[PDB]
Design an enzyme around this catalytic site. Structure first.
Site, PDB file in Angstrom:
ATOM      1  N   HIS A 481       0.798  -1.207   0.000  1.00  0.00           N
ATOM      2  CA  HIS A 481       0.000   0.000   0.000  1.00  0.00           C
ATOM      3  C   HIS A 481       0.842   1.273   0.000  1.00  0.00           C
ATOM      4  CE1 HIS A 481      -3.809   2.192   1.696  1.00  0.00           C
ATOM      5  NE2 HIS A 481      -3.477   2.576   0.476  1.00  0.00           N
ATOM      6  N   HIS A 486       1.104   5.006  -2.934  1.00  0.00           N
ATOM      7  CA  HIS A 486       1.302   6.378  -2.474  1.00  0.00           C
ATOM      8  C   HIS A 486       2.679   6.981  -2.728  1.00  0.00           C
ATOM      9  CE1 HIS A 486      -2.466   6.788  -0.080  1.00  0.00           C
ATOM     10  NE2 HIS A 486      -2.393   5.470  -0.112  1.00  0.00           N
ATOM     11  N   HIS A 672      -4.048   0.275  -6.593  1.00  0.00           N
ATOM     12  CA  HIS A 672      -4.362   0.895  -5.316  1.00  0.00           C
ATOM     13  C   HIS A 672      -5.753   0.478  -4.802  1.00  0.00           C
ATOM     14  CE1 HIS A 672      -6.087   4.186  -2.828  1.00  0.00           C
ATOM     15  NE2 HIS A 672      -4.973   3.944  -2.158  1.00  0.00           N
ATOM     16  N   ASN A 676      -6.426  -1.328  -1.214  1.00  0.00           N
ATOM     17  CA  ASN A 676      -6.945  -0.370  -0.247  1.00  0.00           C
ATOM     18  C   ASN A 676      -8.374  -0.581   0.232  1.00  0.00           C
ATOM     19  OD1 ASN A 676      -6.696   2.420   1.105  1.00  0.00           O
ATOM     20  ND2 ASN A 676      -8.588   2.587  -0.045  1.00  0.00           N
ATOM     21  N   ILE A 821      -7.134   8.363  -1.311  1.00  0.00           N
ATOM     22  CA  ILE A 821      -7.352   8.138   0.114  1.00  0.00           C
ATOM     23  C   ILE A 821      -6.381   7.031   0.553  1.00  0.00           C
ATOM     24  CG2 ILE A 821      -9.185   6.400  -0.247  1.00  0.00           C
ATOM     25  CD1 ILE A 821      -8.591   8.947   2.640  1.00  0.00           C
TER      26      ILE A 821
HETATM   27 FE   LIG Z   1      -4.248   4.460  -0.102  1.00  0.00          FE
END
Ligand SMILES: [Fe+3]
Length: 821
Positions: A481, A486, A672, A676, A821
């Site tokens: 993650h 990110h 993602h 996530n 997010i």
């Molecule tokens: Fe994320």
């Protein structure tokens, strides 16, 4: 000479009256794209102010307001291709668009425009036409390059709220040495010891005690338009982590310090109670939480003493199914972290770690002890039925330092899985390894645990699964993650704004996939991955968490992020030119991979249809000055600590351009989403996804061993994440698993006029239609009774994480365009 225009804007009090915008409050100046001055620069018109409020067209929501305006523009001034805008008001407003008629010409702006005195140069906006550099109208060439130089800044100075400067810096802003030496952290990035992707530069300057660490700040800057406003406060999910760390966490702690709630869970029912009757907390604790935006959406409350979490998807049908060996193995291919399992082609498994440092590394798992449904080990190996979840080499280097911490104890685990004839995976052995060196004070040793359904043996096996999942949760949170999505993506966002003009086709292709990424990352550096932040206080590695991700980055390979390459590298698929996707899965019903290949294919088709519209041959890619500078910077600066690697694509061909864009879009959207949005659905039950382990297996003859026999649930709870950090962690993952109602999903764009090119628009339309087509297919897969074992499992949870669409909320489905997010 008049051109009728319409300006749409949103007053600040909308994303966080009208008549005040009139008079001499806001002026616009058109710039010609066809008629230039004596210096080759497009001619500029007269300052024109807003004339009146337009209350004619219904199609105008989002707290938006339309304003009429007329420009003095004779045919001799050519065709307008851009405009300057100056805001003379004190407060900033959000500019949505400008539309010019008889001459239609559209400008998609979506940008905050602050008071003119705050800008070094006047804000400029271009019409929605798309141009590679060599196609830019001559009168706009210099304006195009000047806007890029403005966006790059000069690499110095403290960035301010209204700045739109994109640049790089290392992760030297996580520690807080000025507050305590205990909060000092190694700088990640810029060294061979700690290589790491770069992040957005903020420039707050050095701390008082360490010149290499950036001082604290109440607000971590991101270029202004990266900070997404929202019409609904409940949709500002990214602010949740800050509130959780700074306001909610301290409130939870007081309840524990005052002993108003039991410090530990004493039975599994105490955990289930959290989403049933709830947890009772002090009044002032409830009062501290209930009024906060975003946070108040995380729990149901009686307004006085109760907080109730939502029922996690994983227990919605069976609250005990998570404990089954079937679900443990299934989540490795359809869970929150479905991308680590690997094929095992030899036995016993081998280690590349130094025995001189960690002791003999030979596996202690014996083939004859395994139940492979009647297969011999050679038969299992040859039929490609043996797999493993291998965290042995990954965790071993950190076990000693982690185990030296109070309340933290882990093993470097390895799990062997067998692919049954019925197509499901079953766990057959778990190796719990510890490093051994001369002088070790600890007498604990490595051990192998085999499946067991009864007796103390069954408790030991359940605990062994917990140690494995603590390893997996840590790897998922920090690597699958945080690092791979990110952190890995940010350098590309920065490079794109610094070198590809808003006019550039690749800028338009990629930017939707960056929405909110720099914003959530900055908020993460401040409250999620900072010293004593959420992750350090809730996950096993504590202060070693983020640096572990740097050690893993040493082996991060851009081209291995492509789904086919990843599957092949992990030995869960083989290249097969005779198949639709070019690869044959070794686990036929591997939900993440099977659904992922469909999405990967759709994105590839889209990119392959888009690129040709702007680059006819490989030379056209080689000669794009912006594209070349973009890629050169993304690699040599953004991911600069790995610039010495041989695997970076060259970007001198159409093939390479397609590859690079395809991988970037894949990571930002589907990859993602898959790692996530299942966080709370699977991890909302702490027993199913423990974030930490606090003790090793007990010695026979001790009261702890007796406890495993007499009170297995307590043995388990004393071993995993404690109750307080569990409350904080559940809150965090609930936020991360929620889709804001203003999300923009794969196949969607925020504006139907992002480009005036009808062909590009047609191509995008086909892409969206294909995704809807794919969703119908995935629905059929979930409804296929023969695939139930892996797509639903004993938890009866249909794998919907790669369904492209979703409504708002904690839905366990939907693929956003970006890491939002
Ligand atoms: Fe994320």
């Amino acid at each position: 000479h008049k051109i009728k225009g319409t300006v749409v804007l949103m007053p600040k009090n909308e994303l966080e009256n009208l008549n005040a915008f009139l008079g001499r409050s806001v002026s616009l100046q058109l710039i010609s794209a066809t008629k230039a001055d004596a210096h080759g620069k497009g001619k500029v018109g007269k300052d024109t102010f807003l004339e009146g409020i337009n209350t004619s067209l219904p199609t105008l929501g989002a707290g938006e307001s339309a304003f009429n305006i007329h420009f003095e523009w004779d045919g001799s001034m050519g065709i307008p291709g851009a405009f300057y805008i100056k805001n003379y008001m004190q407060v900033e407003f959000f500019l949505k668009s400008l539309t010019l008629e008889a001459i239609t010409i559209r400008f998609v702006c979506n940008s905050w425009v602050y008071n003119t005195k705050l800008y070094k140069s006047v804000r400029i906006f271009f019409a929605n036409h798309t141009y590679v550099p060599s196609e830019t109208p001559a009168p706009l060439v210099s304006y195009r390059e000047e806007e890029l130089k403005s966006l790059r800044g000069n690499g110095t100075g403290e960035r301010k709220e209204y700045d739109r400067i994109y640049d790089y810096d290392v992760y030297n802003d996580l520690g807080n040495p000025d507050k305590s030496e205990k909060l000092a952290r190694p700088v990640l990035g810029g060294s061979s010891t700690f290589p790491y992707p770069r992040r957005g530069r903020t420039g707050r300057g050095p701390t008082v005690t360490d010149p290499n660490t950036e001082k604290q700040g109440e607000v971590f800057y991101v270029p202004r338009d990266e900070n997404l406003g929202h019409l609904k406060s409940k949709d500002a999910l990214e602010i949740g982590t800050k509130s959780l760390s700074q306001i909610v966490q301290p409130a939870f702690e007081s309840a524990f310090d005052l002993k108003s709630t039991p410090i530990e869970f004493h039975s599994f029912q105490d955990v289930h109670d959290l989403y049933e009757g709830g947890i009772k907390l002090p009044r002032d604790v409830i009062s501290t939480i209930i009024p906060l935006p975003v946070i108040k959406e995380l729990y149901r409350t009686d307004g006085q003493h109760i907080l109730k979490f939502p029922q996690p998807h994983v227990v919605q049908v069976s609250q005990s199914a998570w404990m089954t060996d079937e679900e443990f193995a299934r989540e490795m291919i359809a869970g929150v972290n479905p991308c680590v399992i690997r094929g095992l082609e030899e036995f016993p498994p081998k280690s590349n770690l130094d025995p001189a440092i960690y002791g003999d590394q030979s596996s202690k798992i014996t083939a004859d002890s395994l139940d492979l449904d009647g297969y011999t080990m050679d038969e299992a190996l040859g039929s490609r039925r043996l797999f493993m979840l291998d965290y042995h080499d990954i965790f071993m280097p950190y076990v000693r330092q982690i185990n030296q911490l109070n309340s933290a104890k882990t093993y470097a685990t390895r799990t062997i899985l067998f692919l049954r004839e019925d197509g499901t995976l079953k766990p057959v052995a778990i190796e719990l390894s510890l490093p051994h060196s001369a002088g070790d004070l600890s007498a604990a040793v490595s051990q192998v645990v085999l499946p067991a359904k009864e007796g103390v043996e069954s408790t030991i096996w359940l605990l062994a699964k917990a140690y494995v999942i603590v390893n997996d949760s840590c790897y998922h949170q920090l690597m699958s993650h945080w690092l791979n999505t990110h952190a890995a993506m940010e350098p590309f966002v920065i490079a794109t704004h610094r070198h590809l003009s808003v006019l550039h086709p690749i800028y338009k292709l990629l930017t939707p996939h960056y929405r909110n990424n720099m914003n959530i990352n900055a908020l993460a550096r401040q409250s999620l991955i900072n010293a004593n932040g959420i992750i350090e206080t809730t996950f096993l590695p504590s202060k070693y968490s983020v640096e572990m991700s740097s050690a893993v980055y040493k082996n991060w390979v851009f081209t291995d992020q492509a789904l086919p390459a990843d599957l092949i590298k992990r030995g869960v698929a083989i290249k097969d030119p005779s198949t639709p996707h070019g690869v044959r899965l070794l686990i036929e019903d591997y939900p993440y991979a099977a659904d992922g290949l469909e999405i990967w294919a759709a994105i590839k088709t889209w990119v392959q249809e888009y690129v040709p519209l702007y680059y006819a041959r490989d030379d056209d890619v080689k000669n794009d000055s912006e594209l070349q500078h973009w890629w050169k910077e993304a690699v040599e600066k953004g991911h600069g600590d790995l610039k010495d690697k041989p695997w970076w694509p060259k970007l001198q061909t159409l093939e390479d351009l397609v590859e690079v864009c395809l991988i970037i879009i894949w990571i930002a959207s589907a990859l993602h989403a898959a790692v996530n949005f299942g966080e709370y659905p699977y991890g909302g039950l702490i027993m199913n996804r423990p974030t930490a382990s606090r003790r090793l297996l007990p010695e026979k003859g001790t009261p702890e061993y007796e406890e495993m026999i007499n009170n297995h649930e307590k043995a388990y709870l004393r071993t995993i994440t404690s109750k307080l950090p569990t409350l904080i962690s559940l809150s965090v993952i609930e936020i991360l698993s929620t889709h804001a109602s203003d999300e923009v999903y794969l196949g969607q764009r925020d504006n139907p006029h992002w480009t005036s090119d009808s062909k590009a628009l047609q191509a995008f339309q086909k892409f969206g239609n294909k995704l809807k087509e794919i969703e119908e297919k995935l629905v059929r897969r979930n409804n296929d009774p023969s695939l139930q074992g892996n797509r639903l499992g004993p938890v009866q949870l249909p794998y919907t994480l790669l369904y492209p669409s979703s409504e708002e909320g904690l839905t366990f489905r939907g693929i956003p365009n970006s890491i939002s997010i």
